[PDB]
Chain A
Amino acid sequence: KYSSKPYKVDNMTRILPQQSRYISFIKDDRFVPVRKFKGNNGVVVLRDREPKEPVALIETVRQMKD
């Protein structure tokens, strides 16, 4: 459901397209909402307003060549 509490896993995993819409990007890091979550979940996108700061950092394989 939705109730607005902590939840066990909320990044990656299997999930569901339907469930992804209940997990919405918090304003409480360097990542800022501007959409209250997009509503789509195929390409992501939270808007980063405080670039190159604390809030994780784990380069993908795309950043080994780009």
Chain B
Amino acid sequence: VIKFRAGVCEYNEDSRLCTPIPVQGEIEIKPNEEEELGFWDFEWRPTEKPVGRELDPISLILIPGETMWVPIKSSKSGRIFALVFSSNERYFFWLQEKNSGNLPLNELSAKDKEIYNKMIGVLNNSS
């Protein structure tokens, strides 16, 4: 699929959060378990121990056509990868590694140029 560094941790229905929660890992955008549906499954898997807690709600489904990317507007110190759709189906994206520094006015974050270029693009595609 399209793999990116990015950890699990709470979605945060409202209220800019991103508790640490273990769930250390890697993020993959795929277009489902069927691998053709316009809904996009957010596949996690641990690569960094996860505190023995899973923190995956037996797949998290991606509602289609309404994905805004908030990369760090609503900054609150370093990266929490935030999914705006109607600012209430909000999905929260945790940070385990801390590579490529904090670099200013790309995300406003702590893990910038790579994950943003991969992230936007994966969002736009229907396949």
Tell me the smallest distance from the CB of A15 to a CB of chain B, in Å: 29
Interface size on B, residues (CB 8 A): 2
What size tier do the contact residues of chain A reach? under 10
A interface, over-half SS: helix
Cβ proximity bits A42-61 to B, threshold 8 Å, 1 near / 0 not: 00000000000000000000
Is B49's CB within 8 Å of the partner chain A?
A: yes
Cβ proximity bits A24-66 to B, threshold 8 Å, 1 near / 0 not: 0000000000000000000000000000000000000011111
Q: How far is the CA of A66 from the CA of B52 in the complex (A)?
A: 5
B49: A residues at CB distance < 8 A: 64
Q: How far is the CA of A65 from the CA of B52 in the complex (A)?
A: 4
Q: How far is the CA of A59 from the CA of B52 in the complex (A)?
A: 11
A64: B residues at CB distance < 8 A: 49, 52
Q: What residues make up the interface of A, taking CB atoms closer than 8 Å to B?
A: 62-66
